[PDB]
CSV table of C-alpha atoms and ligand atoms in Angstrom, one decimal:
chain,number,residue,atom,x,y,z
A,1,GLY,CA,0.0,0.0,0.0
A,2,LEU,CA,0.9,3.7,0.1
A,3,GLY,CA,4.2,4.3,2.0
A,4,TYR,CA,5.7,0.8,1.3
A,5,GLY,CA,8.2,-0.4,-1.3
A,6,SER,CA,7.8,-3.9,-2.6
A,7,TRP,CA,10.4,-5.1,0.0
A,8,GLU,CA,8.5,-3.5,2.9
A,9,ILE,CA,5.8,-5.2,5.0
A,10,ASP,CA,3.4,-3.1,7.1
A,11,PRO,CA,3.9,-4.4,10.7
A,12,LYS,CA,0.2,-3.6,11.3
A,13,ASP,CA,-0.5,-6.7,9.2
A,14,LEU,CA,1.2,-8.9,11.8
A,15,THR,CA,-0.4,-11.0,14.6
A,16,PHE,CA,2.2,-12.3,17.2
A,17,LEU,CA,1.5,-15.8,18.4
A,18,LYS,CA,4.6,-17.4,20.2
A,19,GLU,CA,8.0,-16.4,21.3
A,20,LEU,CA,10.6,-18.7,19.7
A,21,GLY,CA,13.6,-17.4,21.8
A,22,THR,CA,16.8,-15.6,20.8
A,23,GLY,CA,18.0,-16.5,17.3
A,24,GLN,CA,21.0,-15.5,15.2
A,25,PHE,CA,21.4,-11.8,15.7
A,26,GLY,CA,18.0,-11.2,17.4
A,27,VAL,CA,14.7,-12.3,19.1
A,28,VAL,CA,12.3,-14.3,16.9
A,29,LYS,CA,8.5,-14.8,17.0
A,30,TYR,CA,6.0,-16.9,15.3
A,31,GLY,CA,2.9,-15.1,13.9
A,32,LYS,CA,0.5,-14.5,11.1
A,33,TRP,CA,0.4,-12.1,8.2
A,34,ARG,CA,-3.0,-10.7,7.4
A,35,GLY,CA,-4.6,-13.3,9.6
A,36,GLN,CA,-3.9,-16.4,7.6
A,37,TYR,CA,-0.2,-16.8,6.6
A,38,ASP,CA,2.4,-18.2,8.9
A,39,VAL,CA,5.5,-16.2,9.3
A,40,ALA,CA,8.5,-15.9,11.5
A,41,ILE,CA,9.5,-12.4,12.7
A,42,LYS,CA,13.1,-11.7,13.6
A,43,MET,CA,13.7,-8.5,15.5
A,44,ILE,CA,17.0,-6.9,15.0
A,45,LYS,CA,18.4,-5.1,18.1
A,46,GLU,CA,19.6,-1.5,17.7
A,47,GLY,CA,23.3,-1.5,17.3
A,48,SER,CA,23.6,-5.0,16.1
A,49,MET,CA,23.5,-4.4,12.3
A,50,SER,CA,24.6,-2.1,9.5
A,51,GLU,CA,21.0,-1.3,8.8
A,52,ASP,CA,21.0,0.8,5.6
A,53,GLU,CA,23.3,-1.7,3.9
A,54,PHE,CA,21.1,-4.5,5.1
A,55,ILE,CA,17.9,-2.9,3.8
A,56,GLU,CA,19.5,-2.4,0.4
A,57,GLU,CA,20.5,-6.1,0.3
A,58,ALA,CA,17.0,-7.2,1.4
A,59,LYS,CA,15.7,-6.1,-2.0
A,60,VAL,CA,18.0,-8.6,-3.7
A,61,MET,CA,17.2,-11.3,-1.1
A,62,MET,CA,13.5,-10.9,-1.8
A,63,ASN,CA,14.0,-12.2,-5.3
A,64,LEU,CA,15.9,-15.3,-4.2
A,65,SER,CA,13.3,-18.0,-4.4
A,66,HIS,CA,13.9,-21.7,-4.0
A,67,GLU,CA,12.0,-24.5,-2.3
A,68,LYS,CA,15.1,-25.2,0.0
A,69,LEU,CA,15.9,-21.6,0.9
A,70,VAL,CA,14.0,-20.0,3.8
A,71,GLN,CA,12.0,-17.3,1.9
A,72,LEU,CA,12.5,-13.6,3.0
A,73,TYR,CA,9.0,-12.0,2.6
A,74,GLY,CA,10.0,-8.5,3.5
A,75,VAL,CA,11.3,-6.1,6.2
A,76,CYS,CA,9.7,-3.6,8.5
A,77,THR,CA,12.0,-0.6,8.8
A,78,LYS,CA,10.0,2.4,9.8
A,79,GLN,CA,10.4,1.6,13.5
A,80,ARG,CA,13.2,0.2,15.7
A,81,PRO,CA,13.7,-2.7,16.2
A,82,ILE,CA,13.6,-3.5,12.4
A,83,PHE,CA,11.8,-6.7,11.6
A,84,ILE,CA,12.7,-9.4,9.1
A,85,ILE,CA,9.6,-11.4,8.0
A,86,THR,CA,10.3,-14.9,6.7
A,87,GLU,CA,9.0,-18.3,6.0
A,88,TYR,CA,8.0,-20.2,9.2
A,89,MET,CA,10.1,-23.4,10.0
A,90,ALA,CA,8.1,-25.1,12.7
A,91,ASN,CA,10.7,-27.6,13.8
A,92,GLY,CA,13.4,-25.0,14.5
A,93,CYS,CA,17.2,-25.2,14.3
A,94,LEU,CA,18.8,-28.2,12.4
A,95,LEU,CA,21.4,-28.6,15.2
A,96,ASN,CA,18.8,-29.1,17.9
A,97,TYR,CA,16.8,-31.4,15.6
A,98,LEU,CA,19.9,-33.6,14.9
A,99,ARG,CA,20.7,-33.7,18.7
A,100,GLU,CA,17.4,-35.1,19.8
A,101,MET,CA,18.1,-38.8,19.9
A,102,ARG,CA,14.3,-39.7,19.9
A,103,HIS,CA,14.2,-39.1,16.1
A,104,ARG,CA,16.2,-42.3,15.6
A,105,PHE,CA,17.2,-41.1,12.2
A,106,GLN,CA,17.9,-43.5,9.3
A,107,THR,CA,21.0,-42.6,7.1
A,108,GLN,CA,18.6,-42.1,4.1
A,109,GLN,CA,17.1,-39.2,6.2
A,110,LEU,CA,20.5,-37.7,6.9
A,111,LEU,CA,21.4,-37.9,3.2
A,112,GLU,CA,18.1,-36.1,2.3
A,113,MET,CA,19.0,-33.3,4.7
A,114,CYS,CA,22.3,-33.0,2.8
A,115,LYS,CA,20.5,-33.0,-0.5
A,116,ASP,CA,18.1,-30.2,0.7
A,117,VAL,CA,21.0,-27.9,1.6
A,118,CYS,CA,23.0,-28.8,-1.5
A,119,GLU,CA,20.0,-27.8,-3.7
A,120,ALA,CA,19.7,-24.5,-1.9
A,121,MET,CA,23.4,-23.9,-2.3
A,122,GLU,CA,23.4,-24.9,-6.0
A,123,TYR,CA,20.7,-22.3,-6.5
A,124,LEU,CA,22.6,-19.6,-4.6
A,125,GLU,CA,25.8,-20.5,-6.6
A,126,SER,CA,23.7,-20.1,-9.9
A,127,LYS,CA,22.9,-16.5,-8.7
A,128,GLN,CA,26.6,-15.8,-7.8
A,129,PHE,CA,25.3,-15.3,-4.2
A,130,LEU,CA,27.7,-16.5,-1.4
A,131,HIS,CA,26.2,-17.7,1.8
A,132,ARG,CA,29.4,-16.7,3.7
A,133,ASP,CA,28.4,-18.5,7.0
A,134,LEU,CA,27.0,-21.9,6.1
A,135,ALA,CA,26.6,-24.2,9.1
A,136,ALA,CA,24.0,-26.4,10.8
A,137,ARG,CA,23.3,-23.5,13.2
A,138,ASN,CA,21.6,-21.6,10.4
A,139,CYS,CA,19.7,-24.3,8.8
A,140,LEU,CA,16.1,-24.7,9.8
A,141,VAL,CA,13.6,-27.5,9.6
A,142,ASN,CA,9.9,-27.3,8.6
A,143,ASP,CA,6.9,-29.2,9.8
A,144,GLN,CA,7.5,-31.8,7.0
A,145,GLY,CA,11.1,-32.4,8.0
A,146,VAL,CA,12.5,-30.4,5.1
A,147,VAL,CA,15.8,-28.6,5.8
A,148,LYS,CA,16.2,-25.2,4.4
A,149,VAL,CA,19.1,-22.7,4.3
A,150,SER,CA,18.7,-19.5,6.2
A,151,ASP,CA,20.7,-16.3,7.2
A,152,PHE,CA,22.2,-16.3,3.7
A,153,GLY,CA,24.7,-13.5,3.3
A,154,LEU,CA,23.6,-11.9,6.5
A,155,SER,CA,27.0,-11.9,8.3
A,156,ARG,CA,28.0,-9.0,6.0
A,157,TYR,CA,25.8,-6.7,8.0
A,158,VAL,CA,26.5,-7.9,11.5
A,159,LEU,CA,28.5,-5.4,13.6
A,160,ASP,CA,31.2,-7.1,15.7
A,161,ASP,CA,29.7,-7.6,19.2
A,162,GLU,CA,26.4,-9.1,18.0
A,163,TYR,CA,28.2,-11.7,15.8
A,164,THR,CA,30.4,-12.8,18.7
A,165,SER,CA,27.5,-12.9,21.1
A,166,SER,CA,25.2,-15.0,18.8
A,167,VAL,CA,27.9,-17.3,17.2
A,168,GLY,CA,30.2,-17.6,20.2
A,169,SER,CA,33.3,-16.4,18.6
A,170,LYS,CA,34.7,-13.4,16.5
A,171,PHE,CA,34.7,-15.9,13.6
A,172,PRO,CA,33.4,-19.4,12.3
A,173,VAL,CA,36.8,-20.9,12.3
A,174,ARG,CA,35.5,-24.5,12.3
A,175,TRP,CA,33.7,-24.0,9.0
A,176,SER,CA,36.5,-22.2,7.2
A,177,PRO,CA,39.0,-23.4,4.6
A,178,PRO,CA,42.8,-22.7,4.9
A,179,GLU,CA,42.7,-19.7,2.5
A,180,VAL,CA,40.1,-18.0,4.7
A,181,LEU,CA,41.9,-18.6,7.9
A,182,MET,CA,45.2,-17.5,6.5
A,183,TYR,CA,44.3,-14.7,4.0
A,184,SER,CA,40.6,-14.0,4.3
A,185,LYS,CA,40.0,-15.3,0.8
A,186,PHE,CA,36.3,-15.9,0.4
A,187,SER,CA,34.8,-17.5,-2.6
A,188,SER,CA,32.3,-20.1,-3.8
A,189,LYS,CA,34.9,-22.6,-2.7
A,190,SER,CA,34.7,-21.4,1.0
A,191,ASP,CA,31.0,-22.1,0.8
A,192,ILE,CA,31.9,-25.6,-0.6
A,193,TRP,CA,34.3,-26.2,2.3
A,194,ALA,CA,31.6,-25.2,4.8
A,195,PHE,CA,29.1,-27.5,3.1
A,196,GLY,CA,31.4,-30.4,3.7
A,197,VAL,CA,31.6,-29.5,7.4
A,198,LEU,CA,27.8,-29.2,7.5
A,199,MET,CA,27.5,-32.8,6.0
A,200,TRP,CA,29.9,-33.9,8.8
A,201,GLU,CA,27.6,-32.1,11.4
A,202,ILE,CA,24.5,-33.9,10.0
A,203,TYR,CA,26.2,-37.4,9.9
A,204,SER,CA,27.6,-36.8,13.4
A,205,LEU,CA,24.0,-36.0,14.7
A,206,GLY,CA,25.1,-32.5,15.7
A,207,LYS,CA,28.5,-32.9,17.2
A,208,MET,CA,30.7,-29.8,17.2
A,209,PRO,CA,33.3,-30.0,14.4
A,210,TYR,CA,36.7,-30.6,16.0
A,211,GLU,CA,35.0,-31.2,19.2
A,212,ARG,CA,38.0,-31.6,21.4
A,213,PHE,CA,39.9,-28.6,20.0
A,214,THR,CA,39.6,-24.9,20.5
A,215,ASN,CA,39.2,-22.6,17.5
A,216,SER,CA,42.9,-21.8,17.7
A,217,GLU,CA,43.8,-25.5,17.7
A,218,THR,CA,41.5,-26.1,14.8
A,219,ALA,CA,43.1,-23.5,12.7
A,220,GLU,CA,46.5,-25.1,13.4
A,221,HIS,CA,45.1,-28.5,12.5
A,222,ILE,CA,43.7,-27.4,9.2
A,223,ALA,CA,47.1,-25.5,8.5
A,224,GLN,CA,48.9,-28.8,8.9
A,225,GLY,CA,46.6,-30.3,6.3
A,226,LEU,CA,44.7,-32.4,8.7
A,227,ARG,CA,40.9,-32.8,8.5
A,228,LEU,CA,37.7,-34.1,10.2
A,229,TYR,CA,37.4,-37.8,10.0
A,230,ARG,CA,34.5,-40.1,9.2
A,231,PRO,CA,31.3,-40.0,11.2
A,232,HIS,CA,30.2,-43.5,12.2
A,233,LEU,CA,26.9,-43.1,10.3
A,234,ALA,CA,28.6,-42.1,7.0
A,235,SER,CA,29.4,-44.8,4.5
A,236,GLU,CA,32.6,-44.6,2.7
A,237,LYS,CA,30.8,-43.1,-0.4
A,238,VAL,CA,29.3,-40.3,1.8
A,239,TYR,CA,32.6,-39.6,3.5
A,240,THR,CA,34.3,-39.3,0.1
A,241,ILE,CA,31.7,-36.6,-0.8
A,242,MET,CA,32.2,-34.5,2.4
A,243,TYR,CA,36.0,-35.0,2.2
A,244,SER,CA,36.1,-33.7,-1.4
A,245,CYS,CA,35.0,-30.4,0.0
A,246,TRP,CA,38.2,-30.0,2.0
A,247,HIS,CA,40.9,-30.1,-0.7
A,248,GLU,CA,43.7,-27.9,0.3
A,249,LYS,CA,43.5,-26.3,-3.2
A,250,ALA,CA,40.2,-24.4,-3.6
A,251,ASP,CA,40.2,-25.0,-7.4
A,252,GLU,CA,40.2,-28.7,-6.8
A,253,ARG,CA,36.9,-28.7,-4.7
A,254,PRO,CA,33.7,-29.5,-6.5
A,255,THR,CA,30.8,-27.2,-7.3
A,256,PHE,CA,27.4,-27.5,-5.8
A,257,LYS,CA,26.1,-29.0,-9.1
A,258,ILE,CA,28.8,-31.8,-8.9
A,259,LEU,CA,28.0,-32.4,-5.1
A,260,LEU,CA,24.3,-32.7,-6.0
A,261,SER,CA,25.1,-35.3,-8.6
A,262,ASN,CA,27.3,-37.2,-6.1
A,263,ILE,CA,24.6,-37.1,-3.5
A,264,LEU,CA,22.0,-38.4,-5.9
A,265,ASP,CA,24.3,-41.2,-7.0
A,266,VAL,CA,24.7,-42.4,-3.3
A,267,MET,CA,21.0,-42.1,-2.7
A,268,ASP,CA,20.4,-44.4,-5.6
A,269,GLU,CA,23.1,-46.9,-4.6
A,270,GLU,CA,22.2,-46.9,-0.9
A,271,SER,CA,18.4,-47.2,-1.7
B,1,7GB,C1,18.3,-22.1,14.8
B,1,7GB,C2,19.0,-22.6,13.6
B,1,7GB,C3,18.2,-20.8,15.0
B,1,7GB,C4,17.6,-20.1,16.2
B,1,7GB,O1,18.3,-19.3,16.8
B,1,7GB,N1,16.3,-20.3,16.5
B,1,7GB,C5,15.6,-19.6,17.7
B,1,7GB,C6,14.5,-19.0,16.9
B,1,7GB,C7,14.1,-20.0,15.8
B,1,7GB,N2,13.9,-19.4,14.4
B,1,7GB,C8,14.7,-18.6,13.7
B,1,7GB,O2,15.8,-18.0,14.2
B,1,7GB,N3,14.2,-18.3,12.5
B,1,7GB,C9,14.6,-17.4,11.6
B,1,7GB,C10,15.9,-17.4,11.0
B,1,7GB,C11,16.3,-16.4,10.1
B,1,7GB,C12,15.5,-15.3,9.9
B,1,7GB,O3,15.9,-14.4,9.0
B,1,7GB,C13,16.4,-14.6,7.8
B,1,7GB,C14,16.0,-15.6,7.0
B,1,7GB,C15,16.6,-15.7,5.7
B,1,7GB,C16,17.6,-14.8,5.3
B,1,7GB,C17,18.0,-13.9,6.1
B,1,7GB,C18,17.4,-13.7,7.4
B,1,7GB,C19,14.2,-15.3,10.5
B,1,7GB,C20,13.9,-16.3,11.3
B,1,7GB,C21,13.0,-19.0,12.4
B,1,7GB,C22,12.1,-19.3,11.4
B,1,7GB,N4,12.1,-18.7,10.1
B,1,7GB,N5,11.1,-20.1,11.7
B,1,7GB,C23,11.0,-20.8,12.9
B,1,7GB,N6,11.9,-20.6,13.9
B,1,7GB,C24,12.9,-19.8,13.7
B,1,7GB,C25,15.3,-21.0,15.7
């Protein structure tokens, strides 16, 4: 309506239903838009984000649309805190979901979770859009058990204290390739590296990568050319896929298109 750009939601159209707790970079609620449509509403605390830059990027993020990407519906920026309005993912954080032993997951389910994320990332790669902080902690799960990628690109707008507070370190060392840790060289291939770590997290039912090491120790380990090793639930073929993401040379790592092909091949063999 009058006063709103295509990227802007009128917060008066929101009904708040449940508090979902403190999420990445803000408090999150479940509600409805215009009475009928489920949404999540992420409230961005004053001082936590480069807001004008974020708002400009939200216009681009609105046009990203894929079944395995948490949809950004719009933002509410005429008040503080600003709101991010998104697809609602009823079953919450992937890491919490993996860690609930009651689910008694089959490996076919764990592979499907990998495939969901791979499809989302193949889409982003096709749009030359880097995630920049891919990890199980920002994948969500819907009421149908579908995993979707969230918080894509958002780390670019987080000011230092909020990032540290929400992630638990200045930086996602455990999901970073050598060229990032050494030289800050981000690329599609740093997203590939992170994807392999995420596959490891899925097949390890939500263990912390390098679980006995500090971040400092992890960076040294990766510097020495050493790697995560095989989760017990991963077959040799699955381990080969995740391990391919960790080549010391970025140009020797696969693309998301190749990963998807590899994952489908294992699904067909392990059917
Ligand atoms: C677990 C992975 C995250 C977490 O901290 N949770 C507590 C609240 C609950 N939760 C959400 O955080 N989100 C969610 C994530 C991201 C956004 O914003 C956004 C999406 C896409 C691109 C950029 C920014 C909004 C909300 C939830 C959603 N969507 N539904 C259900 N619970 C959510 C998990």
